[PDB]
Nucleic acid binder design. Sequence first.
RNA 1: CAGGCUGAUCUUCCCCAAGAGUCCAUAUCGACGGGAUGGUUUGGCACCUCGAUGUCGGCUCGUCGCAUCCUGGGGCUGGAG
RNA 2: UGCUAAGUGGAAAAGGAUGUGCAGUCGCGAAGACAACCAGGAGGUUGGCUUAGAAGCAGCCACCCUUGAAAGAGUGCGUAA
Lengths: 23, 37, 136, 362, 192, 176, 126, 133
Amino acid sequence: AKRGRKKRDRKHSKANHGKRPNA
Amino acid sequence: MKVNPSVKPICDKCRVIRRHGRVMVICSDPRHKQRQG
Amino acid sequence: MLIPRKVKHRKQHHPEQRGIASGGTSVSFGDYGIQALEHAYITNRQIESARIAINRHIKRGGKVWINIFPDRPLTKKPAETRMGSGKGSPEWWVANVKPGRVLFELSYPDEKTARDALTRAIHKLPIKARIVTREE
Amino acid sequence: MDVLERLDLDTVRDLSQRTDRLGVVSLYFNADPTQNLQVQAIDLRNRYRLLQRRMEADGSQRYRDVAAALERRRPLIETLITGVASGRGRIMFIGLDGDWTVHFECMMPVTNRVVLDDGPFIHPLVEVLDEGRPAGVVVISADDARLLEWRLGQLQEISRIAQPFGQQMREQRQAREREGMQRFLTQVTATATELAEERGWERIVVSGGQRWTEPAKTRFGPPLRGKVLVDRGLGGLDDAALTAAVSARLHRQHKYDEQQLLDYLCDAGGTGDVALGLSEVTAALNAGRVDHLVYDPAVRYVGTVGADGSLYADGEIATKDSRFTERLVDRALATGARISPVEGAADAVLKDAAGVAAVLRW
Amino acid sequence: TANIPNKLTANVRTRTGKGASRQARRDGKVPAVLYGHGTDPQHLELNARDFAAVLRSHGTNAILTLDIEGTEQLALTKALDVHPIRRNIQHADLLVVQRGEKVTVEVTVLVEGDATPGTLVTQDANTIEIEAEALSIPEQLTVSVEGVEAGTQITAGQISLPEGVNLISDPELLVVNVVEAPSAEALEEEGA
Amino acid sequence: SRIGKQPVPVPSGVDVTINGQNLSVKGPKGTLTLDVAEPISVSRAEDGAIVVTRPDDERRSRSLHGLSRTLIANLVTGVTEGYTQKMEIFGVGYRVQLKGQNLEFALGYSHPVLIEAPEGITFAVESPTKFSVSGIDKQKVGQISAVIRRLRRPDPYKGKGVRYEGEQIRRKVGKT
Amino acid sequence: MAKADKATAVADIAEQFKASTATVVTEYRGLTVANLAELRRALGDSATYTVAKNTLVKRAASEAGIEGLDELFAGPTAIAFVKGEAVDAAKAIKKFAKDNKALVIKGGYMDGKALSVADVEKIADL
Amino acid sequence: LIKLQIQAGQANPAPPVGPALGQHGVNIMEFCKAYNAATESQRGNVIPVEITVYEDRSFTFALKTPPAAKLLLKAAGVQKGSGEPHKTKVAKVTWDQVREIAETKKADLNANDIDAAAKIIAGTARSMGITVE
RNA sequence: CAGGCUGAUCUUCCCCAAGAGUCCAUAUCGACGGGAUGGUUUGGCACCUCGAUGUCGGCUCGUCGCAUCCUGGGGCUGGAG
RNA sequence: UGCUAAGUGGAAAAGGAUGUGCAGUCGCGAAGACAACCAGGAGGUUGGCUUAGAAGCAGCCACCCUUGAAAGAGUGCGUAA
């Protein structure tokens, strides 16, 4: 589950402020 | 040599040291020799 | 294994896992105890596995108290079926544990064996815990 | 006035310690219907008659009392001839002065024997127990699974499990059935392992068919996979044929194990780890060094017994008896050794050692 | 028993609430309240490390002497608010007292001595109530289990109290219970 | 700490030269040179002794302080007394003979094995099953002895192979 | 061996010092408890044979005017107090000294003065 | 030095004395004949022997008083002591009896007084559950 | 049917050590309980394709991973050879 | 002004561990503490029971006394004992 984990974990950027669509 | 995530001093003469970034147990009894990995 | 004799409602919502414990955070019966540090459902099988680990270590003398009871049931629907058509039948009984709650207790004449026996039981539980005493 | 069940080494030890003021007579009756039963009955009666006549041809107070006691306990033998259950081999220990009797029956065959002794005569019972160790039987099909136990030549059921995972292209259906069958094997082997740990099984006979017999063998753990016997035709057999097949398989395995033990004893004889010959075996039993005693049950050993109970072989310097094997077995039981009577040890491999050998503890 | 009161410096709080108490604790302080027969509570602040030192050695029912901005006061510790996890002192109730006054106080009882080797000592009641003078509260109470045989109930009425101390709780409290040591078979049937 | 706070006494017939951080010592039986780690300063007291000091009590200054004193102490011992090692051989048919300046070993192989002597050390043989390795440098002597020791794999059953003079190996038993 | 235990032990040695007519000091290293028993039984009539920490004895030596014995408390040390007589005690040591050879005499105190190792030997002879 | 216990009334048994000093190269028959000659004065109390061998295998054996544990069992009439002392006590022994054992152990104990040696024997009685009065 | 998310089930490891192992938890097996990786099995969802993404097995041709069957280098052994 | 030596920064659990920095309690110590070297480490006795054996050291119960500077009814290794 590398693709799913990477896409969810990239919502912890400073520009996203902890949220992205589709998590 | 035992390669386990957990190393412990099985007997009273085992010593825990740190070589090259690993944690190791060295004893005069060759069975008790073991490293972390 | 600990099982209630009867319950009014057999299918229930999941227990909530928010907040810290209000009551049961102090050692009352014995001299040593195990205090939780995380939220979990402690199943009635992990309690039996954890109080036999204490029994084996201390052998003959001493007394053991279990301060939590597996009252609340969790369901499980039949295997390999689509979603829908009812709610599953109960299968295991859990206890809602919050941080600060004291789970087990022990009385034993000497300290080194008492703290070793309680350590053998923290390794059977799905949470972190620490050993506390009656003193302040 | 009681009937024993579940014979084992502890029960044999506790029974051999009994005693009677006059004596105990031990009767082993061979009621196998393959041989003529009336012949065995007459043979047993004749053996009793010779025992009684040898009592009555001495001329002593003790001997006349013993002869009277023997004449009084006559009808118990005709009771034995028509015993309680439907067994092949029957065994009865009768106390002379007292009014106590012990009855036992088993499917393992025996040979007629009437022995008068201070205590019960144990030797053939140990042989029967050696040849009748328990085992488990597991039968698998695509639908169900039977679990049975074999003990002393008799098969009794334990469980009958059904397929819980049994429920479009043919390939997908076959794959689903394969997965269900694998889960079924895992569950059945788990149940069998639990039962083996419970009831002390030594060997397991696993049958699955022409496809599912080897996977079931490999599912068992390393503790048990070394003691699993593979047979493929156990399915569809009735109880009689099933019992016959399991008995034959276990007999073959037991003979193979005995051959391996004899080879080990022959090889290790010479390094001082094991002792060969009656003299060294008796000397080791005196100090209780024997961890494993092996003797040929057919050979009639002659021995001498001292005041302190120590056993002395021929030429060792004192009451001399011809039923010395009973004393050897009693001492081995007393010292906690393991008795393995290998039928035929004194023939080829251990011919120079008369068939008797011991595995020393040090 | 004569106890020399412990001197502690107290400051009157300017702002109360939950935002001001959290900030006070972040600066090594503890909020406190000083009520009693003065009948007008005072909101104080105490040093966190100095307060904990007094409680560590002189017990929980420590007599105090607060310096409330130049005014001396005799106070007694009444209650404490301790975090279950972090094990802090979040608050402290203080009761004003004067010399020659009787107060009701719970003191701890300790079990010293080795009993018969085939017995297990189980202590039921941790503390008992007394009624002593303001400056004469015992720091702890002790009982002796030396040669006590089999099943005996050591009751709260048999605790040896100093002079000027009167038992308040009923004299039928089972304080210490000495019983036969459980065997291995008795362990496996407790909690199954 | 305890190791590196004591001086290194210098006997009479030793010429010690300090050039900044590079330290040289001349003795009756050779010359040796040592380069000291930068935080530690090496200097000679007026009583003819070499002293090492460290400015700070940091983790790295303490570690290199006790280290540096011992190498200096080993540096003056190797030029006045020297270093030697006594070794032995056990087993039947196991022998040593000194060929030229090298060594010949017979250790149950199908071929003799030689040990070329590196410059700085010399070999000496007393008995066919007894020899020694001597030199001027402590680490050079120790390294070559280790190579000789591991010529045969350790034998816990009969103890065949090369050992040290005081070596006390561990043993077991294979009976049959 | 806390502060009081050390203080207790120094009082006993000082108490055991004034009650003795004379005293001799020896070193005992290498003597088995079986060997120590024989020497004590032979001396058990009058003398008492004890050992203690040298530093703690020196403090006990400050209670009595025996300031000339401060150099006898280096190395292992056994002090043998004689309750009565002087000839009997020294001779019993000599027969032991010439047998085990592991016990030698460090010195002795008498008449307010330390007595040399040879001069202690003459008490038994006289 | 092999510490061995042979009862006084037993001559040349197999278990106790047979393999004990046989393996050490010591005489197997010559020990008993000197031992039986000396041990026939008691004839009723088991007395241990300390086989002290010399360079030429000459053994300077020494005879010892019977154990203080045995001397308390027959001083109270019970064959074997208690397996659970402090719970079951087999018998009773008067304080005057205890001094008698300390008298026959006088050459084998540490104590100099008779009261101190009485306490030593009383220690062994405690371990086997014999009350001393 | 394939792809995608999940990972109950499956698979590969691991944490504590009750015990088996003639003695001896850790030569070799490791129970009750706990924590995870992989996306290889059976499933759950129904996100692309129904103005068409042809489905099992074999043949021909391959390319990659190592969680290694042989060959290659070692530590421990209840490894005498 | 400090921290990190891991390219951590620039993925992950139970759990294992003399990595390092800060703050706070407790014990021992110039009456010589910790480490190292020299010497003692005993007697009743092989404590009692159990066991083929059980002698400090499978297991169960107790855990005393003496000479003493101290010496445990014994912290490990080891022998069938």
